[PDB]
């Protein structure tokens, strides 16, 4: 019984002003960079997961796999981590995302799973059967983990494997992405479902797109690197290049530090990127126009971020015009603070009004 709209309609829908480029700081001073760098690695160390909690995620997987195969024997039911839990970007307070696979299609009834998990002591058990991807949500009070589960959405397993591959290519990607994600949680702009802002997966695509567009690039366009694609276990070629040992080091030509990349990330999205004209596409690794995708007609197209496996889908579709204006303001707010090295203020915890 509470409204979670992050960006109030009183914000309006107007485009932000194009700032005189000579007034937009182009690089960190040496003092600001050095201190921001040490602050970011201190933040990253606190964000890194601990082994005790990582063990709890795997125990939840095992517990769930046992519950399911005991209740419905014979169907080779398997339980897989994905999302943050499988792409190297989770922290200890990250929820668990789980994909349950089986050829037994009758398991795709998420409320049947809710009844079983409730009966065996899970708490806050809810099922959402009308979502694009039906889910069951639980709180495990023994392991103290929140968990969203779906059944047989293998597409999410592949784009998790893709993000994991991107994270594995250059060692700056994991700390950069974790710190930006932490920023999105603290400013509460990571809630596409109820807040009208952007999903964590949308944010990760924006980070990867920015890194692909650096000169030199930090990350390649994996979907376009046909010669480094391996054959998967199902016999088909991978959709994206995934021979990690051959890919590792691709970004080594780019010599910018973590501090400079965080500054440039916010500078890019605060002032450089023309939201009105372009679509970000980590599938291509280059900018696309909205018009070449017919996305000038798309409802909720202020921000266009192409899903790399279904390029008909805009990940930015959860932000209407008002929400985009507030997101853009948050990105400029972040740029102004990181330009002066103020990582703590940048990550101030947003609280909803009463
Ligand atoms: Cl993630
Ligand atoms: Mg989740
Ligand atoms: Mg529009």
Author numbering: 245 to 598
Share the article's original sentences.
Template-independent terminal ribonucleotide transferases (TENTs) catalyze the addition of nucleotide monophosphates to the 3′-end of RNA molecules regulating their fate. TENTs include poly(U) polymerases (PUPs) with a subgroup of 3′ CUCU-tagging enzymes, such as CutA in Aspergillus nidulans. Here, we report structures of the catalytic core of T. terrestris CutA (TtCutA) in the apo form and its complexes with a non-hydrolyzable CTP analog and A3 RNA.
The other crystal was CutA in complex with an A3 RNA oligonucleotide, which was obtained by soaking crystals of apo protein crystals with RNA. In the CutA–A3 complex structure, the 3′-terminal nucleotide of the RNA occupies the position of the incoming nucleotide. Therefore, it represents a product complex that forms after incorporation of the nucleotide but before translocation of the RNA to allow binding of the next incoming nucleotide. In this structure, a single Mg2+ ion is observed that is located closer to the position of the divalent metal ion A from the canonical fully formed polymerase active site. The exposed 5′-side surface of the base forms van der Waals interactions with the side chain of Val377. The third nucleotide of the RNA in the CutA-A3 complex (nt −2) is located in a narrow cleft between the finger and palm subdomains.
